[PDB]
Ligand binder design. Structure first.
Ligand SMILES: CCCCCCCCCCCCCCCCCCCC(=O)O[C@H](COC(=O)CCCCCCCCCCCCCC)COP(=O)(O)OCCN
Ligand SMILES: CCCCCCCCCCCCCCCCCCCC(=O)O[C@H](COC(=O)CCCCCCCCCCCCCC)COP(=O)(O)OCCN
Ligand SMILES: CCCCCCCCCCCCCCCCCCCC(=O)O[C@H](COC(=O)CCCCCCCCCCCCCC)COP(=O)(O)OCCN
Ligand SMILES: CCCCCCCCCCCCCCCCCCCC(=O)O[C@H](COC(=O)CCCCCCCCCCCCCC)COP(=O)(O)OCCN
Ligand SMILES: CCCCCCCCCCCCCCCCCCCC(=O)O[C@H](COC(=O)CCCCCCCCCCCCCC)COP(=O)(O)OCCN
Ligand SMILES: CCCCCCCCCCCCCCCCCCCC(=O)O[C@H](COC(=O)CCCCCCCCCCCCCC)COP(=O)(O)OCCN
Ligand SMILES: CCCCCCCCCCCC
Ligand SMILES: CCCCCCCCCCCC
Ligand SMILES: CCCCCCCCCCCC
Ligand SMILES: CCCCCCCCCCCC
Ligand SMILES: CCCCCCCCCCCC
Lengths: 1024, 144, 48, 48, 48, 48, 48
């Protein structure tokens, strides 16, 4: 093939131009995101049954929905939780690779057949099925510095006009609101109800009857009489619009004749739909707007368009209403992409510099500066073809493959120049023969590197999607690099090259070093046998370092924002949790003035379950330019915040940093489900969980920080209605229950229309009449006659413990356990210990692994089998290249040499064994194997064609291969040196990649140049 | 043709007729299933001790091992050879007539006294200033 | 009586059902056992 | 193009003064001047 | 039924159209609200 | 129609580029495709 | 699949005849089909 393109430079140039155009078009038409889809598809069913506890919600909604969740394809598992706020949260997790649209529509159609079984209130509120995606892009915030309008007024303003305009931005159309629009609130008053002999049932009936749309037909409608000439629609009574119109609603007429309206009996206002969540922003009211990202959309373009749209909407804003951005990492993605592109361009520049330093030929130095970008653009085109996107993983795979691209582009030109020098030939003949010497070696290298990189895109589970990005990126880059080095680089060498005081000294010292190296290699071929023992020591040390290095998933890095979770004890109110959320934001805006830019404090929306004793304040820091030093990073700020929050003891405040992927984390951690499968009950399962927790606490050597992911039982106010006593007094059960629920839990009766937008109408007791158990004495229910029997007459009160959050796994009651393996031991034997402990539980209590422990359990053994297949295929490719069964062993013995350096670099800098380190290790061993392939191919070619002796051939081979190895190693080390020394602005990934790659490359370059010759000699002499 | 699009189209058209069906049909549950006509397999359950009757075995199967099987991938339909437990109320015409009662009275009383009612909360939002305790209120539960 | 969904595989579905039953078995009451009075998959396996 | 429309204003208090409910008022207004689909029947074996 | 175009638009058309966003390969969307109460929304997607 | 009018110049440019590249690749010269692309306006004016 | 010699006839009530006329027609067709044993074997109605 290279001979074909040497004679036809124009064809090679045309192919290169085609590749570059395809790559440019792909770059112009590739979606950009921080990370691709990693978590398996999940579909979430959310239901609201206001006024109900965990058990009522469970029994009436959750079980009914779960028993009808059958016949859905590719379902991995399902888990539901029912909260004491009246919320059903059912998450169904599917197999990876199944399109979530068909899964969501299947879940919807399967649920829509269970709607008639749900309570009327649950149906009326609505049940929402939606995909649980990680497309979370930005959090817009609308605050009111002017202090006039409340949080409800801001929420309604956001929902009325901003939401629709934002949802039509170029990009996403899916948005969420951190609040609720207006709702016509009717706050009753028990005293007026008792005075007028009225009940909340009467108010509900009056509101329903006197606010509704009724059809009325039309006049002149078909069939008409003969001679009809007029046809007009008829408009009957319409829905109410104003608060005063609801005020005029007549409840009853009095015996004497006076009129009773709602205003006389209740207070009518434009309140919120719910008051469970109070959002704040630096101590002042605010309303948020969560913005996702559409599939196949550019995150940067979407964020820019949304910001432009908000700026365009800004002029027609009322007083105040500044647009803030409490959570947005668009600039993080842009900074990371810019750093990656800077790394690539600096690598190209360093290749230019190194090539001119070793080869004093300006024309030759440039053959690789116009060939590597071609491979990069081809890689972009292939990524576009395979349906991938521009994310952190793909660009880091590209910066890892850049070293091998450089390796190829340098090897070809270096050997061409060496042939021109030694042989003294014109460029065309020299490059013709040069390609002949390295053309079979370049095809074997491609096969070997494909065999070592492809069998990691087939890892199962969530992490397999992470590995697939690197696998496909690097394999496409290598295939394209080999194609380019076979097509375009020979043509450039044939055409551009011209036949042939610090640089003189550099040449002299390099020649002296080459002579010394050749003498050393000749010497170590006579003392062979000690170096085999040294290699065995190296292998043992590599094994020790690999089994010593801790593991992880991805480096958590300073994104500029972090969270703080506040968890007051059970039974705490909203104002009690608001005080702590004020102690937290005051601390952040006082003790961290130079680092904290804003704090968004959501009250009632906790981390382990929404309520009133929970809250989360997420903090947006200033730009990384404004936070110099290691003490101004998120890691050094969260620890200080937690230390300062240890003092407050009435609550449990904990500041932490977001994970790299919100859907993953805690690679050493495990998730455990304790299920009851005999109908034991909630309390027996709680006792089993307590026993298992005690047993786990009795094993501090293996399991660390095992805790139940749930809420313990809390006191509850039980009202027991005597049926015989109620029937004796002539009061109906459906009236007692209705008045109790409407007064204390609220009741959504119907809808009204204001400002051209349908809104809800809620009836509830005024706050002061529903706060204490004794307030029950304020409420009277009308008997069969005009009496007003007190609640106290027919009911009794009690305090008893009940669960505020009941969770089920796969349709059965369950308890969740979060655990972590010991630092010195992996997470595989921790799962075994948890199984062994769970095996000693009361009869009827089983267990299960969920979340990421579910994936580990079934898809945690793919790696050894895939690597064995890779090694077998590498053997086959190398034996095919060398036409021998023993020679490939010499090539394969360069693997520990590259592994040990990466392991040493990881240990020295305190890094862990994450995905970046593993991919860098694979890159290092691939490059070292490629160098070994070239050396052994040259040596055996000298043996075969020229009939040289073994020592002479293996000495000349390293003599003429020394320069390219040093050139490529120096270029790659200088290219990734800034990655090692980099702090802030997404430096965790950069360090995790660069440290391992640099250490492995340095050690492999130092060791291979001495071990490949002795390996080849030992293989040739021991065999044959 | 793929059965996914066929099933979603059939359900889309069936949701139009759903409001027109009697309330009893909707309460029982209308199901749309894509499966074969013949049984893939039959898994029987027996009791060797001879204590459980046909009713007990069928109830156990339906309650504890039918839902999980129905959610197994590839299982398009499950037919239970029996029926799970339910509160059977065998009402006597003679004793109903003796007390001047009717089946509608029995149904009304059961609906009234076998409810799972939402009673609200103590100190629920919006709370009055100075509230200290927050507790759920539980009024009535399903009979068991 | 289990009928497989259209387009599914009849052998891996049977394997999954048997796995579910195996998980179910340890929590059965005393004396309750599972029999297989009808199965079209073993014929397929023996024929292949 | 825009069309004239006939609007009926019903006084709730004046209705309840005379003893007529608003529900049957709406029913008799809708059923008289507009169609009122009551239920089904069988014509020639078909539900109409 | 029973609602004119104005009282059906902001009731159903405006609240359905606002949620008709985020669907990929959508060219445009039109709608119409009759005085009979019927509402028709047409979403036209990209060709192919 | 507006979409088709907005993409004709791009279609012509891409077609010309592809033909030029194919001719240069096949005939192993840059002068031959450049001389061939000079006759295109004659055919274009004929069609016009 | 059935047998190679099997067929599944399906008599339709195209008009509004009813159940009695349809079953009379089915009985007449069955009686006529029973008169050709040399060609039709075991012609039976599937329903009750
Ligand atoms: C895969 C594409 C690259 C493969 C290397 C090039 C190659 O196979 O081409 C020549 C073999 O004959 C060929 O020409 C094989 C077909 C190569 C073109 C594939 C398109 C080698 O070159 P050579 O024939 O000069 O050397 C013969 C040395 N034993
Ligand atoms: C051989 C076939 O050509 C070849 O080996 C190469 C022919 C062109 C195929 C490569 C085209 C690349 C297209 C995709 C790139 C992106 C020609 O040479 P020969 O066998 O007659 O021997 C003479 C060589 N010294
Ligand atoms: C793209 C891959 C092909 C290699 C790179 C170009 C060199 C082509 C030479 C080989 C010939 C075979 C390939 C055919 C040419 C494909 C390029 C045109 C594709 C195309 O219509 O994209 C237009 C690019 O034009 C603008 O640049 C504006 C934008 O047009 P569009 O946006 O309508 O196409 C969106 C489709 N849905
Ligand atoms: C010259 C440039 C050549 C480009 C080479 C790139 C090859 C990368 C593809 C590697 C690969 O097999 O990954 C597939 C990516 O899927 C998407 O195709 C896996 O595909 P998969 O997950 O469907 O395979 C398993 C189901 N049996
Ligand atoms: C996909 C297949 C692409 C072709 C791969 C190698 C084809 C051999 C011909 C070739 O490329 O030219 C030789 C280089 O061979 C080499 O460099 C081949 C050595 C690498 C071995 C890879 C394993 C074999 C791939 C096929 C496995 C079967 C799967 C079916 C495609 C010229 O030089 P030469 O003839 O002196 O080289 C001794 C090899 N015998
Ligand atoms: C760019 C996108 C469009 C594609 C354009 C394809 C261009 C085709 C290549 C033309 C070069 C000539 C050629 O094929 O080489 C031959 C050499 O034969 C050989 O020794 C066999 C060479 C194998 C040719 C493979 C053709 C496909 C290229 C990939 C004939 O050479 P010649 O033109 O001198 O005629 C012989 C008169 N002495
Ligand atoms: C000249 C030897 C070619 C054998 C391989 C045929 C497939 C490559 C097509 C490109 C032109 C030969
Ligand atoms: C047939 C040769 C195609 C070359 C362009 C890539
Ligand atoms: C614009 C994206 C590239 C178009 C050419 C197809 C590349 C196929 C790679 C396999
Ligand atoms: C730029 C996206 C194109 C991908 C498909 C290539 C064929
Ligand atoms: C989805 C599987 C894709 C793998 C395709 C392999 C073909 C690569 C050919 C590259 C040769 C230059």
């Amino acid at each position: 093939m290279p001979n074909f393109f040497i004679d036809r430079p124009i064809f090679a140039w045309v192919i290169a131009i085609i590749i570059m155009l395809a790559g440019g078009l792909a770059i112009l038409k590739l979606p950009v995101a921080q990370y691709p889809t990693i978590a398996p598809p999940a579909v979430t069913i959310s239901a609201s049954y206001p006024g109900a506890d965990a058990k009522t919600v469970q029994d009436t909604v959750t079980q009914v929905i779960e028993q009808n969740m059958n016949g859905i394809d590719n379902l991995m598992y399902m888990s539901s939780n029912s909260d004491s706020t009246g919320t059903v949260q059912i998450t169904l997790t599917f197999e990876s690779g199944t399109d979530a649209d068909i899964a969501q529509v299947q879940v919807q159609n399967k649920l829509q057949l269970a709607m008639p079984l749900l309570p009327q209130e649950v149906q009326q509120q609505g049940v929402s099925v939606e995909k649980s995606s990680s497309s979370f892009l930005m959090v817009v915030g609308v605050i009111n510095t002017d202090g006039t309008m409340t949080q409800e007024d801001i929420s309604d303003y956001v929902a009325a006009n901003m939401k629709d305009a934002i949802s039509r931005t170029s990009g996403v159309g899916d948005v969420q609101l951190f609040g609720s629009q207006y709702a016509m609130r009717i706050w009753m008053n028990p005293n007026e109800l008792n005075k007028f002999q009225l009940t909340p049932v009467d108010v509900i009936t009056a509101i329903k009857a006197q606010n509704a749309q009724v059809a009325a037909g039309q006049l002149g409608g078909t069939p008409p009489v003969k001679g009809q000439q007029l046809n007009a629609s008829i408009i009957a009574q319409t829905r109410l619009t104003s608060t005063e119109e609801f005020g005029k609603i007549l409840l009853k007429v009095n015996q004497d004749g006076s009129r009773v309206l709602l205003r006389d009996v209740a207070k009518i206002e434009l309140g919120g739909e719910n008051y469970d969540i109070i959002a704040e922003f630096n101590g002042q009211p605010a309303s948020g707007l969560g913005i996702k990202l559409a599939t196949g959309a550019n995150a940067l373009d979407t964020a820019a368009a949304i910001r432009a749209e908000l700026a365009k909407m800004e002029p027609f804003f009322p007083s105040g209403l500044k647009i803030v951005y409490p959570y947005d990492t668009t600039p993080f993605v842009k900074i990371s992409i810019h750093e990656v592109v800077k790394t690539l361009v600096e690598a190209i520049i360093l290749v230019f510099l190194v090539m001119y330093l070793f080869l004093q030929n300006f024309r030759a130095t440039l053959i690789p500066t116009i060939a590597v970008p071609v491979v990069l653009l081809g890689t972009f085109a292939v990524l576009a073809a395979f349906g991938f996107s521009i994310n952190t993983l793909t660009m880091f795979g590209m910066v890892l493959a850049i070293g091998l691209l450089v390796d190829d582009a340098i090897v070809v030109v270096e050997n061409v120049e060496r042939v021109m020098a030694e042989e003294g030939l014109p460029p065309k003949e020299a490059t013709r023969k040069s390609m002949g010497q390295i053309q079979g070696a370049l095809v074997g290298i491609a096969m070997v590197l494909s065999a070592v990189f492809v069998p990691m895109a087939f890892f199962g589970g969530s992490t397999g999607a992470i590995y697939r990005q690197f696998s496909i990126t690097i394999v496409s880059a290598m295939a394209l690099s080999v194609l380019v080095a076979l097509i375009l680089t020979p043509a450039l060498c044939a055409t551009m090259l011209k036949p042939i005081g610090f640089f003189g000294w550099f040449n002299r010292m390099f020649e002296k070093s080459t002579h010394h190296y050749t003498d050393s290699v000749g010497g170590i071929l006579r003392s062979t046998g000690r170096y085999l023992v040294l290699y065995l020591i190296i292998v043992v040390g590599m094994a020790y370092l690999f089994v010593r290095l801790p593991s992880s998933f991805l480096p958590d890095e300073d994104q500029g924002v972090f969270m703080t979770m506040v968890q007051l004890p059970a039974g705490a109110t909203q104002e009690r949790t608001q005080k702590v959320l004020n102690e937290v934001t005051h601390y952040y805006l006082t003790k961290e003035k130079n680092n904290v830019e804003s704090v968004f404090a959501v009250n009632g929306f906790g981390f382990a379950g929404r309520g009133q004793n929970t809250g989360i304040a997420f903090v947006s820091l200033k730009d990384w330019a404004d936070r110099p030093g290691e003490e101004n990073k998120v890691e050094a700020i969260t620890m200080r915040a937690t230390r300062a929050f240890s003092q407050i003891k009435d609550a449990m405040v904990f500041a932490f940093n977001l994970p790299a992927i919100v859907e993953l984390g805690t690679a050493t951690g495990f998730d455990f489900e304790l299920i009851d499968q005999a109908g034991l009950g909630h309390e027996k399962l709680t006792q089993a969980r307590n026993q298992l927790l005690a047993e786990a606490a009795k094993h501090p050597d293996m399991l660390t920080s095992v805790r139940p992911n749930g809420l313990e039982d809390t006191p509850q106010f039980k009202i027991d209605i005597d049926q015989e006593k109620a029937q004796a007094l002539g009061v109906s059960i459906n009236d007692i229950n209705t008045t109790l629920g409407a007064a204390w839990g609220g009741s959504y009766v119907n809808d009204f229309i204001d400002r051209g937008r349908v809104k809800k109408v809620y009836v509830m007791s005024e706050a002061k009449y529903r706060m204490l158990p004794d307030d029950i004495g304020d409420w009277y229910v009308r008997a069969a006659d005009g009496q007003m029997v007190p609640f106290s007459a027919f009911s009794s009160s009690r305090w008893e413990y009940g669960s505020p959050r009941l969770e089920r796994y796969n349709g059965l009651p369950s308890m969740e356990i979060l655990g972590q393996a010991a630092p010195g031991k992996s997470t595989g034997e921790a799962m075994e210990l948890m199984e062994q402990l769970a095996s000693k539980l009361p009869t009827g209590v089983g267990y299960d692994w969920t979340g990421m422990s579910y994936q580990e359990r079934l898809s945690g053994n793919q790696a050894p089998s895939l690597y064995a297949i890779s090694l077998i295929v590498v053997f086959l490719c190398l034996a095919a290249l060398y036409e021998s069964w023993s020679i490939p062993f010499s090539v394969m013995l360069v693997v520990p040499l590259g592994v040990i350096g990466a392991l040493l670099a990881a240990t020295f800098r305190g890094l862990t064994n994450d995905v970046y380190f593993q991919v860098g290790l694979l890159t290092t061993i691939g490059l070292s194997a490629k160098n070994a392939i070239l050396i052994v191919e040259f040596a055996k070619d000298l043996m075969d064609k020229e009939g040289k002796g073994l020592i002479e051939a293996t000495l000349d081979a390293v003599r003429m291969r020394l320069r390219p190895i040093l050139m490529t190693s120096l270029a790659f080390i200088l290219g990734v040196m800034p990655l090692v020394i980099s702090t802030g602005a997404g430096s965790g990934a950069q360090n995790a990649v660069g440290t391992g790659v640099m250490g492995g490359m340095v050690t492999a370059t130092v060791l291979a140049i001495f071990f490949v010759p002795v390996f080849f000699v030992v293989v040739r002499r021991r065999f044959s």
